[PDB]
Design an enzyme around this catalytic site. Structure first.
Site, short mmCIF file in Angstrom:
data_model
loop_
_atom_site.label_atom_id
_atom_site.label_comp_id
_atom_site.label_asym_id
_atom_site.label_seq_id
_atom_site.Cartn_x
_atom_site.Cartn_y
_atom_site.Cartn_z
N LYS A 1 1.49 0.93 -10.47
CA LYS A 1 1.06 1.95 -9.53
C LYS A 1 -0.33 2.44 -9.92
O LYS A 1 -0.54 2.92 -11.04
CB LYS A 1 2.07 3.09 -9.54
CG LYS A 1 1.86 4.15 -8.48
CD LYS A 1 3.21 4.65 -7.98
CE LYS A 1 3.10 5.97 -7.23
NZ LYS A 1 2.07 5.93 -6.16
N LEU B 1 9.61 -3.81 -12.70
CA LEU B 1 9.39 -4.59 -11.49
C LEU B 1 10.72 -4.88 -10.80
O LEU B 1 11.59 -5.54 -11.36
CB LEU B 1 8.70 -5.92 -11.83
CG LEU B 1 8.51 -6.93 -10.68
CD1 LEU B 1 7.56 -6.38 -9.62
CD2 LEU B 1 7.95 -8.22 -11.26
N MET B 2 10.86 -4.38 -9.58
CA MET B 2 12.10 -4.54 -8.83
C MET B 2 11.95 -5.64 -7.79
O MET B 2 11.48 -5.40 -6.69
CB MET B 2 12.46 -3.21 -8.15
CG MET B 2 12.61 -2.03 -9.13
SD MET B 2 14.21 -1.99 -9.99
CE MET B 2 14.05 -3.31 -11.09
N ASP C 1 10.96 6.17 -6.35
CA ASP C 1 9.82 7.03 -6.05
C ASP C 1 10.20 8.50 -6.19
O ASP C 1 11.28 8.91 -5.78
CB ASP C 1 9.33 6.77 -4.63
CG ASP C 1 8.17 7.65 -4.25
OD1 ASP C 1 8.39 8.86 -4.00
OD2 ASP C 1 7.03 7.15 -4.21
N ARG D 1 13.68 4.28 1.72
CA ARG D 1 12.32 3.83 1.43
C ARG D 1 11.91 4.16 -0.01
O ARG D 1 10.97 3.57 -0.54
CB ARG D 1 11.34 4.48 2.41
CG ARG D 1 11.16 5.99 2.23
CD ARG D 1 10.57 6.62 3.49
NE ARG D 1 9.86 7.86 3.20
CZ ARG D 1 10.35 9.09 3.39
NH1 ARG D 1 11.57 9.27 3.89
NH2 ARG D 1 9.61 10.15 3.08
N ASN D 2 12.61 5.11 -0.63
CA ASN D 2 12.36 5.49 -2.02
C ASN D 2 13.39 4.90 -2.98
O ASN D 2 13.50 5.33 -4.12
CB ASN D 2 12.35 7.01 -2.15
CG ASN D 2 11.31 7.66 -1.25
OD1 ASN D 2 10.16 7.22 -1.20
ND2 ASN D 2 11.72 8.71 -0.54
N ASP E 1 13.74 14.10 -1.55
CA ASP E 1 13.56 13.07 -0.53
C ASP E 1 14.33 11.79 -0.80
O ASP E 1 13.74 10.71 -0.88
CB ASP E 1 12.08 12.73 -0.35
CG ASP E 1 11.83 11.80 0.83
OD1 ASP E 1 12.70 11.72 1.72
OD2 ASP E 1 10.76 11.16 0.87
N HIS F 1 0.86 -1.18 0.00
CA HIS F 1 0.00 0.00 0.00
C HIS F 1 0.90 1.23 0.00
O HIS F 1 1.75 1.39 0.87
CB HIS F 1 -0.89 0.01 1.25
CG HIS F 1 -1.51 -1.31 1.57
ND1 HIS F 1 -0.82 -2.50 1.48
CD2 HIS F 1 -2.76 -1.63 2.01
CE1 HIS F 1 -1.61 -3.50 1.85
NE2 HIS F 1 -2.79 -3.00 2.17
C1 LIG Z 1 8.62 -6.60 -5.41
C2 LIG Z 1 8.25 -5.49 -4.49
N1 LIG Z 1 8.02 -5.82 -3.21
N2 LIG Z 1 7.71 -4.65 -2.63
C3 LIG Z 1 7.39 -4.61 -1.22
C4 LIG Z 1 7.74 -3.59 -3.47
C5 LIG Z 1 8.09 -4.07 -4.73
C6 LIG Z 1 8.22 -3.18 -5.91
C7 LIG Z 1 8.92 -3.55 -7.07
N3 LIG Z 1 9.07 -2.75 -8.18
C8 LIG Z 1 8.49 -1.49 -8.18
N4 LIG Z 1 8.65 -0.67 -9.32
C9 LIG Z 1 7.77 -1.00 -7.06
O1 LIG Z 1 7.25 0.28 -7.19
C10 LIG Z 1 6.49 0.95 -6.15
C11 LIG Z 1 5.75 2.07 -6.89
C12 LIG Z 1 7.41 1.51 -5.04
C13 LIG Z 1 8.58 2.24 -5.43
C14 LIG Z 1 9.46 2.77 -4.46
F1 LIG Z 1 10.54 3.44 -4.87
C15 LIG Z 1 9.23 2.60 -3.09
C16 LIG Z 1 8.09 1.90 -2.66
C17 LIG Z 1 7.18 1.35 -3.62
C18 LIG Z 1 6.01 0.63 -3.02
O2 LIG Z 1 6.19 -0.57 -2.77
N5 LIG Z 1 4.80 1.34 -2.76
C19 LIG Z 1 3.68 0.63 -2.16
C20 LIG Z 1 4.54 2.76 -3.04
C21 LIG Z 1 7.65 -1.88 -5.94
#
Ligand SMILES: Cc1nn(C)cc1-c1cnc(N)c(O[C@H](C)c2cc(F)ccc2C(=O)N(C)C)c1
Length: 293
Positions: A50, A98-99, A170, A153-154, A149, A32
């Site tokens: 997203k 996807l990371m 982020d 976490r980002n 920022d 979330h």
């Molecule tokens: C696998 C996986 N496991 N988890 C826990 C997250 C991923 C994940 C993989 N690839 C992404 N591109 C991705 O992007 C989002 C937008 C994001 C980007 C960021 F920089 C920080 C947090 C978030 C996030 O998780 N939010 C809820 C805002 C999330």
């Protein structure tokens, strides 16, 4: 449609690559994101999706459209890629690389070296994460984009395993630019939270705090201190202590990043030089990390 300028070019929502909704398929939630969910999905190509809440204010939306515009115009290996968008259906989707490793903060906390896994992480791993993000910060700096920022976490990781690559993932802060207790003051230099002044030297200060997050293995900065106590502390010339077991050469980068005068804080080319020197230094990378029981 709002405008966005970067690297000498204006672009508009029309420039966003619309992916037809039929091609996109949600698989599982992933987390979330305060406002809206993020899913794992397929377009086969694997993606993080997203989403924009169908019920949201007009500002929620512009913020959303703006974030897509920002991430799409970046081209760098340490900034998360945008596969496209799906704006022409509700809920609206932003499609990202996807990371698999998830966010950097969660990663450090869950993969801390443990008695069972005594060597799950070594100094060289953190040095590599740091270099990755600083390289992305270098890219932002030289394109005159201020992130506002930079924090664990980002940041995201491509994979859990050793060949992992850290990227900035982020941009919802440089997007919004809320209240006091919302601002990430623990990652902010004094002139930023006093005067609202942002320059490239903003990210340098923030990067030092991220460096601290990395080498403490995922702790909240200024442990046991509230935002206001940090504000006064940082304002009085206080700085964090070394995380557990941190090599002196690495801590030195942090303090250089935490210089009161922004003009005294390094640019990211220098920071990279210094991180490169730490990775070359056996006393640094032979230093064992703490095992939490
Ligand atoms: C696998 C996986 N496991 N988890 C826990 C997250 C991923 C994940 C993989 N690839 C992404 N591109 C991705 O992007 C989002 C937008 C994001 C980007 C960021 F920089 C920080 C947090 C978030 C996030 O998780 N939010 C809820 C805002 C999330």
């Amino acid at each position: 449609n709002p405008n966005y300028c970067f690297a000498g070019k204006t672009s508009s929502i029309s420039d966003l690559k619309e992916v037809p909704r039929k091609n996109i398929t949600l698989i599982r939630g992933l987390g979330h994101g305060a406002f809206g969910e993020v899913y794992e999905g397929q377009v086969p190509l694997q993606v993080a999706v997203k989403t924009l809440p169908e019920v949201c204010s007009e500002q929620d939306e512009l913020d959303f459209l703006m974030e897509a515009l920002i991430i799409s115009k970046f081209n760098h290996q340490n900034i998360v890629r945008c596969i496209g968008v799906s704006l022409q259906s509700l809920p609206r989707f932003i499609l990202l690389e996807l990371m698999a490793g998830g966010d950097l903060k969660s990663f450090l906390r869950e993969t801390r070296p443990r008695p069972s896994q005594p060597s799950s992480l070594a100094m060289l791993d953190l040095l590599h994460v740091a270099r990755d993000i600083a390289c992305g910060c270098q890219y932002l700096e030289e394109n005159h984009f201020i992130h506002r920022d930079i924090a664990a976490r980002n940041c995201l990781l491509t994979c859990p395993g050793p060949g992992r690559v850290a990227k900035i993932g982020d941009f919802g802060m440089a997007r919004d630019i809320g209240g006091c207790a919302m601002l990430p003051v623990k990652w902010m230099p004094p002139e930023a939270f006093m005067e609202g002044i942002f320059t490239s030297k903003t990210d340098t200060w923030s990067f030092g705090v991220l460096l601290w997050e990395i080498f403490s293995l995922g702790y909240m900065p200024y442990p046991s201190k509230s935002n206001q106590e940090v504000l006064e502390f940082v304002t009085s010339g206080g700085r964090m202590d070394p995380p557990k077991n941190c090599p002196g050469p690495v801590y030195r980068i942090m303090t250089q990043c935490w210089q009161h005068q922004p003009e005294d804080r390094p640019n990211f080319a220098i920071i990279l030089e210094r991180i490169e020197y730490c990775t070359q230094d056996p006393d640094v990378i032979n230093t064992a990390l703490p095992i939490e029981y």
